[PDB]
């Protein structure tokens, strides 16, 4: 699953469902108070949902919301990328 | 009071109170498109040529018509041999004149073509627009692009549909759709194109910060302090270094072999070469407007011109008394300038052995040079007791502007691509930004250390500046800070530190990306 | 069905071939 990061692509046809499912689970929690493909989904669901939620919030109503965080590059992210590149 | 002196002096002196260009442009544009469209656009190639040729025959430019026919015959030698032979009045020409060519096309493709032609109207777009409006009719249809194996052709062949009248009419879609396998509003279309394009213009800058920039660094190893000067070619394909050992070394920047035109040197495998022939240290190297020619100057007092196709010297220029310090090609590469120890600025053409213009008036040695983007003005700077910048006209040879204010040795000069702003740097760490028409100082930029800023560069729109320093840093500068929405100066955008490598050369590409070069000193 | 195993083997062989086709800079490996 983690090795497949360096060898395969995947489509964005299951990200909306992941976002909605995570949103419903989080809302309920707050209110209370193939096989390789399946493994890939099980491993990446949470991160994909978070990224989808961020992107969805940024472009609400097809307008650039000026109160959301800017898109800026940092050094910790590049360090993570370098880690993955050394893995490859 | 200098104002009183100037006023008195003025009062006492009596002062009162053709078609081939368009064809090539179209060919390149078609070459740069997506594949799915290339089948349709090519239908425009054959007409635009034929009519154009006839036009020359109508205007008496027989030689131009012959040259055009010969140059483009290769593209059609495999198809239009009979038509080419016939063209090289007949009834076919009369039929062409009477019957206007039909060019079916898709709606979106037509919109893209019209917008592209408008965008390049003065570079050859007008010719094609006029030709299409006069001798063509672009029957636009709302179908999809047609190809021998696209959906349209497959569907039509499978369902056994007929041929549309517009696409009925030397290759045509019929041969692709035959069993053997609307009108136009040009001129009005251009008006609509311009009117709609006018609606998406950005007209200010309030708030925000500067612009992000990427940098690529080239580092030289095992030089032992022998490298004096460095330069990059216009397309970032070559790099040249002049040393204290009198020779020049050139490298290809991607490691591929360098090519020679000599028969003995056919298919030779080397990616760097040496130019030998100077007798003293080399202090300047300049690539000409691929680069074919190189100019060098040395402490022996000579200027040398080298061919980069055979890698040998062509001419020596000997107009200087003492060392020459700087040499520079003109913005388009036929004139060039030189300056050095004897306080005079010389302007040559590559055509003549003697300098054609001599500029006199500096009181000290020259330390920096620069050209104006229009090719008719030069800039020079002197050191020591006379730390001033002078602007020289090339037609007369006289000085037109003097800029004063530096108190340290000046290391670099640079004129903006718009021809209105000047920049200078010295060994105190300051950068001066000057208005040229008023002769006044616009501002100062601070933040570099002491030692010298050898290189500056402007961006394509001249709104950003990049500087390289001997303090092992590269810095980016905003030329105008945004409007208020209601040791280091606030107009610096970025600073990047190098790893023990003084920066000798920096340059901007077409994008927000710069290339820098330097030599590594491990100690 | 039994087609799945056959096509999986075909893809395995094809991928083994594909591994050696490209080079470091994305160009074809002529050897």
């Amino acid at each position: 699953a983690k090795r497949s990061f360096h060898t395969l692509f995947y489509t964005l046809e299951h990200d909306r469902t992941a976002m909605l499912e995570q949103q419903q689970l989080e809302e309920s929690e707050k209110q209370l108070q193939d096989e390789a493909y399946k493994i890939w989904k099980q491993v990446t669901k949470k991160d994909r949902a978070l990224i989808a939620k961020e992107r969805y919030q940024l472009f609400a109503n097809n307008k650039l919301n000026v109160e959301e965080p800017a898109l800026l590059r940092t050094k910790a992210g590049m360090r993570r990328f370098l880690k993955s590149r050394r893995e490859a | 009071n200098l104002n009183q002196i100037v006023t008195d002096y003025l009062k006492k002196k009596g002062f009162t109170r053709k078609y081939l260009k368009a064809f090539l442009l179209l060919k390149n544009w078609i070459d740069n498109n997506l594949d799915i469209y290339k089948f349709e656009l090519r239908k425009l190639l054959w007409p635009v040529f034929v009519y154009s040729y006839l036009e020359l025959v109508s205007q008496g430019y027989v030689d131009d018509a012959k040259h055009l026919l010969e140059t483009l015959r290769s593209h059609f030698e495999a198809v239009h041999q009979d038509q080419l032979a016939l063209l090289d009045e007949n009834h076919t020409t009369r039929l062409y004149r009477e019957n206007k060519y039909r060019i079916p096309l898709n709606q979106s493709l037509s919109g893209n073509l019209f917008h592209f032609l408008e965008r390049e109207a003065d570079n050859g777009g007008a010719t094609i627009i006029y030709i299409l409006q006069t001798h063509c009719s672009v029957e636009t249809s709302a179908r999809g692009p047609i190809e021998p194996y696209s959906f349209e052709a497959i569907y039509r062949r499978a369902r056994n549909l007929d041929l549309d009248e517009a696409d009925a009419h030397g290759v045509t879609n019929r041969d692709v759709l035959d069993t053997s396998a609307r009108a136009r509003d040009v001129v009005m279309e251009m008006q609509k194109v311009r009117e709609n394009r006018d609606r998406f213009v950005i007209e200010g800058r309030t708030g925000g910060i500067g612009i992000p920039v990427s940098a690529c660094m080239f580092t030289f190893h095992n030089t032992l302090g022998t490298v004096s000067c460095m330069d990059f070619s216009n397309d970032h394909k070559l790099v040249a270094v002049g040393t204290m050992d009198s020779y020049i070394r050139v490298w290809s920047l991607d490691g591929k072999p360098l090519k020679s035109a000599l028969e003995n040197e056919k298919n030779l495998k080397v990616n760097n070469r040496k130019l030998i022939g100077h007798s003293g240290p080399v202090y300047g190297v300049s690539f000409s407007d691929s680069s074919k020619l190189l100019l060098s100057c040395s402490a022996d007092g000579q200027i040398r011109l080298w061919s980069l196709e055979i890698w040998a010297c062509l001419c020596i220029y000997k107009a200087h008394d003492g060392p020459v310090f700087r040499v520079l090609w003109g913005p388009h590469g036929h004139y060039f300038a030189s300056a050095g120890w004897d306080k005079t600025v010389r302007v040559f053409t590559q055509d003549h052995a003697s300098a054609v213009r001599i500029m006199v008036g500096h009181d000290t040695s020259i330390s920096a040079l620069a050209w104006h983007p229009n090719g008719t003005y030069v800039f020079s700077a002197s050191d020591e007791m006379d730390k001033s910048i002078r602007m020289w006209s090339v037609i007369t040879g006289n000085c037109v502007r003097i800029f004063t204010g530096h108190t340290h040795y000046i290391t670099a000069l640079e004129c903006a691509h718009n021809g209105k702003i000047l920049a200078s740097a010295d060994t105190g760490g300051n950068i001066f930004i000057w208005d040229i028409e008023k002769g006044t100082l616009i501002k100062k930029c601070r933040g570099h250390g002491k030692g010298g800023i050898p290189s500056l560069s402007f961006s394509a729109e001249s709104n950003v500046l990049v500087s390289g320093g001997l303090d092992c840093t590269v810095r980016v500068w905003d030329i105008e800070l945004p409007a208020d929405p209601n040791q280091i100066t606030p107009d610096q955008i970025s600073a990047f530190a190098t790893k023990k490598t003084p920066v000798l050369k920096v340059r901007f590409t077409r994008m927000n990306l710069i290339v820098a070069g330097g030599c590594y000193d491990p100690e | 069905d039994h087609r799945r195993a056959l096509f999986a083997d075909l893809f395995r062989r094809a991928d083994e071939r594909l591994n050696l086709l490209f080079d470091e800079r994305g160009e074809y490996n002529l050897s």
Binding site: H6, T7, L8, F9, Y10, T11, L12, E13, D15, R16, A52, R55, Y56, L58, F59, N62, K63, L64, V66, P69, A70, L71, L72 | L34, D35, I36, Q107, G111, N112, H115, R119, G144, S150, F151, V193, N196, R199, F200, I202, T206, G207, G208, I209, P212, S214, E461, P485, I493, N512 | R4, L6, F7, L10, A14, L18, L21, F22, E24, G26, Y28
Partner: protein
């Protein structure tokens, strides 16, 4: 006193405690321009003036020399629109056209974002469902062909600075192709993608040897329909 704090965020340093918002980094004119472009491109009215406005917006995106700060936003917007509107052929076609116009601007450094652009395009090439009688098939196949052309362009342009892009794309398309369970449209998209990303040698070495079986276990039942 006059130095901006957001500048420290632009250097990417770790100790920074200030988190700028969009309004602190992008000027108001650029925000208005982005909004105008997005409003113009995503209009479905059949009026001629609207088509002219859409074409003008695409040309503006394709030629403007001052859009360096909006590139990440363009990429994110394309990704979001493709992700959340897979049941609309018009929107997907507009997104593909916008992606084509963005990578044709000669003033933009696009290398690091190349892969980020290859994910939406792929989703438009081998997605099992696109949209929600003949006209629908026309639209779907035209969209798939356009996606394949754009993928070919991307792979050709940005294949050297992204070393593993070409093998990854080719392997994905090949994996999708050698699967009898997929519907014919996905197989068409997969073969187009293999040709676009791999090249002539990829087809010669990977596709042809397996064709003998392919036409027997896949094409015959479909022909029998």
């Amino acid at each position: 006193p006059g130095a901006n704090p957001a500048l420290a965020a632009l250097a990417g340093n770790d100790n920074v405690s200030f988190r700028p918002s969009v309004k602190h980094v992008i000027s108001k004119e650029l925000i208005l321009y982005f909004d105008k472009i997005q409003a113009a491109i995503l209009d479905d009215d059949p009026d001629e003036e609207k088509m002219r406005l859409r074409q003008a917006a695409l040309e503006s995106v394709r030629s403007d020399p001052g859009l360096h700060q909006l590139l990440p936003y363009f990429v994110n917007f394309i990704t979001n629109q493709v992700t959340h509107h897979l049941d609309d052929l018009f929107i997907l076609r507009q997104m593909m056209e916008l992606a084509e116009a963005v990578v044709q601007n000669p003033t933009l450094f696009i290398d690091p974002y190349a892969s980020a652009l290859a994910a939406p395009v792929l989703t438009c090439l081998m997605s099992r469902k696109l949209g929600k009688i003949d006209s629908t098939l026309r639209e779907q196949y035209s969209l798939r062909e356009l996606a394949a052309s754009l993928l070919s362009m991307i792979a050709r342009k940005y294949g050297a600075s992204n070393a593993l892009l070409r093998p990854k794309l080719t392997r994905t398309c090949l994996k999708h192709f050698l699967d009898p369970t997929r519907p014919p449209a996905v197989l068409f998209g997969a073969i187009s993608g293999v040709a676009a990303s791999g090249g002539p040698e990829a087809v010669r070495v990977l596709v042809l040897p397996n064709l003998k079986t392919f036409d027997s276990a896949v094409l015959q039942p479909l022909r029998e329909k």
